């Protein structure tokens, strides 16, 4: 049947084989499940890489639908996870048996970086004393916000960013399930603008399919509003090759016609700077000035003056690069 769902939730890897990237980690967790030797897991990485979906597929593989409510205790940041919850419901779930069928239980603590340090210190002996009865899975995006005791007690798997070569078949599966007309440059634009994020890949795909009806490079870069790489090359050429007035006029006309934002222009110019064989002092000056301009855009500032400063940071270094020779 059809459901009114976002494509990040309509297409979720309910089984472990539907995930794409981390094949060694998923194979090791599958061999943990098959041997019934599942340890305390610590899944960390950037968002959108498949940490929640992995443990949900593992929980559905370990437990049946008639025993899932008494075997899995899933708590996240939307629930209260204070120290009275660690001493209360979590300890009573860990220290007791099951109801229907005998087996080890699972405590899923999603977004474990948001927990307080008192709760994390109270979690240590609950994990250690009841290893035979229950298992604890900790999910976080920041490993520095989890205490080193819980990092020692749980074996850590890094769910790194998804490579664009592996995000193509899952996007093709979503495309062929949703009847989406997409070209090759549309797929390249999706996997370039995602930057190791499967969630925003499906979000950009759904928004581009609804906005235009076809997914090409121009439709993706128009719906997202991201500048094209030819536009960034033209901006760099104007900033490095002519005077202040003509570069200001050309960059202002390009930003007015294309409807560009200075944040993405700064990001792509920062990526272009390290590719250009600059002198070291010129590179340091450009990085400091671009970081200052990027910091200035986080408040109620005028974007035209910051665009002029972005032009100025290269108009200063024109003479230094040329006189370096």
């Amino acid at each position: 049947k059809i459901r009114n769902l976002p494509w990040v939730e309509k297409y979720r890897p309910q089984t472990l084989n539907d995930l794409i990237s981390h094949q060694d980690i998923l194979s090791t967790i599958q061999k943990f499940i098959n041997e019934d030797r599942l340890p305390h897991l610590l899944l960390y990485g950037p968002p959108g890489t498949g940490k929640t979906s992995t443990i949900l597929a593992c929980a559905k593989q370990l437990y049946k639908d008639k025993e899932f409510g008494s075997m899995v205790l899933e708590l996240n940041a939307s629930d209260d996870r204070g120290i009275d919850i660690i001493r209360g419901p979590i300890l009573s779930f860990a220290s007791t048996r099951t109801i229907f069928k005998k087996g080890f239980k699972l405590v899923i603590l999603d977004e474990a970086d948001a927990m307080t340090q008192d709760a994390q210190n109270a979690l240590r002996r609950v994990i250690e004393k009841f290893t035979e009865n229950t298992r604890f899975c900790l999910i976080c995006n920041y490993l520095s916000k989890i205490i080193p005791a819980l990092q020692s007690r749980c074996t850590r798997f890094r769910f790194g960013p998804l490579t664009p070569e592996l995000m193509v078949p899952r996007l093709e599966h979503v495309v062929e399930e949703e009847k989406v007309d997409i070209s090759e440059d549309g797929m390249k634009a999706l996997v370039t603008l995602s930057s190791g994020d499967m969630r925003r890949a499906l979000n950009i795909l759904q928004s581009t399919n609804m906005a235009f009806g076809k997914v090409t490079e121009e439709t993706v870069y128009t719906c997202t509003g991201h500048p094209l790489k030819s536009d960034i090359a033209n901006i760099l050429d104007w900033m490095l090759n002519q005077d202040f007035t003509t570069a200001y006029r050309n960059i202002t006309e390009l930003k007015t016609l294309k409807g560009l934002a200075l944040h993405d222009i700064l990001t792509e110019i920062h990526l272009f700077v390290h590719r250009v064989d600059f002198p070291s002092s010129v590179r340091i000056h450009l990085l400091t000035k671009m970081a200052d301009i990027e910091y200035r855009l986080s408040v109620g500032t005028n974007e035209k003056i910051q665009l002029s400063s972005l032009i100025a940071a290269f108009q200063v270094t024109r003479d230094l690069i040329v006189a370096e020779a």
Partner: protein, 261 residues
């Protein structure tokens, strides 16, 4: 269209008062047989099975089956201002989100229409095994409320044992131990106060006192309680309402470990 009419208002108060700090939200399953409720607690340790029969209500009609998950703290505030000698009507439509509660005042002069917004939790059905038990004990509910209250003063976990002789309550605490052994109290004038042993195999298990004390707040529902115990299946605290249905309380045993020495 679902329309259930409580003949008495005290039973709905006494059911909800037992489940107030235990059941997170009420899952009323409605069919032609009656009203069912199988919901776990917040800690996923206890399970509450409530079955209200259709013949217990004053008027009961049900066209299509419904599963109306609703909040219980919201249901607690509308049941405090409810009389104990008046009829309460449960109403809900086919494709609506309002659960209507119509009753009378303690002054018995005004209608009181209390709507509740239904919840959309997707809860999987828990499979009750319905197997036999190695111990079945009939017991007064007033005595079982007293003993679990008396052993909460000593410790926090009770090692309740049963055998052919009777049920035994033990609580090893900080002060010491409290051992209660009651057996064969059927030689009295009343009929509710009696200890009857049905099954054979002895079983010793340890349970939390916090959940057992929550189970004993259903004491005004039934004057006699039934305790079921076995070595694998959990402890069942079966209340049977006189003309309305029955209530079952499940509690998992705690993990205990022997000393290596």
């Amino acid at each position: 269209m679902f329309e259930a009419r409580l003949v008495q208002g005290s039973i709905l108060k006494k059911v909800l008062e037992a489940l107030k700090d235990l059941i997170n939200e009420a899952c009323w399953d409605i069919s032609s047989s009656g009203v069912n409720l199988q919901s776990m607690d917040s800690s996923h340790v206890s399970l509450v099975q409530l079955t209200l029969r259709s013949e217990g209500f004053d008027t009961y009609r049900c066209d299509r089956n419904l599963a109306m998950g609703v909040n219980l703290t919201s249901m607690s505030k509308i049941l405090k201002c409810a009389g104990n000698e008046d009829i309460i009507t449960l109403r809900a439509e086919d494709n609506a989100d309002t659960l209507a509660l119509v009753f009378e005042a303690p002054n018995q002069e005004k209608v009181s229409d209390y709507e509740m917004k239904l919840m959309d939790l997707d809860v999987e059905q828990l499979g009750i095994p319905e197997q036999e038990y190695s111990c079945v004990v009939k017991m007064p509910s007033g005595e079982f409320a007293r003993i679990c209250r008396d052993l909460s003063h000593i410790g926090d976990a009770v090692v309740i044992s049963c055998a052919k002789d009777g049920v035994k309550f033990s609580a090893s605490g900080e002060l010491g131990n409290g051992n209660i052994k009651l057996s064969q109290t059927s030689n009295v004038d009343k009929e509710e106060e009696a200890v009857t042993i049905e099954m054979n195999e002895p079983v010793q298990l340890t349970f939390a006192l916090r959940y057992l004390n929550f189970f004993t707040k259903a004491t005004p529902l039934s004057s006699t309680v039934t305790l079921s115990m076995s070595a694998d299946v959990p402890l069942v605290v079966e209340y049977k309402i006189a003309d309305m249905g029955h209530l079952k309380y499940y509690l998992a045993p705690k993990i205990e470990d022997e000393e290596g020495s």
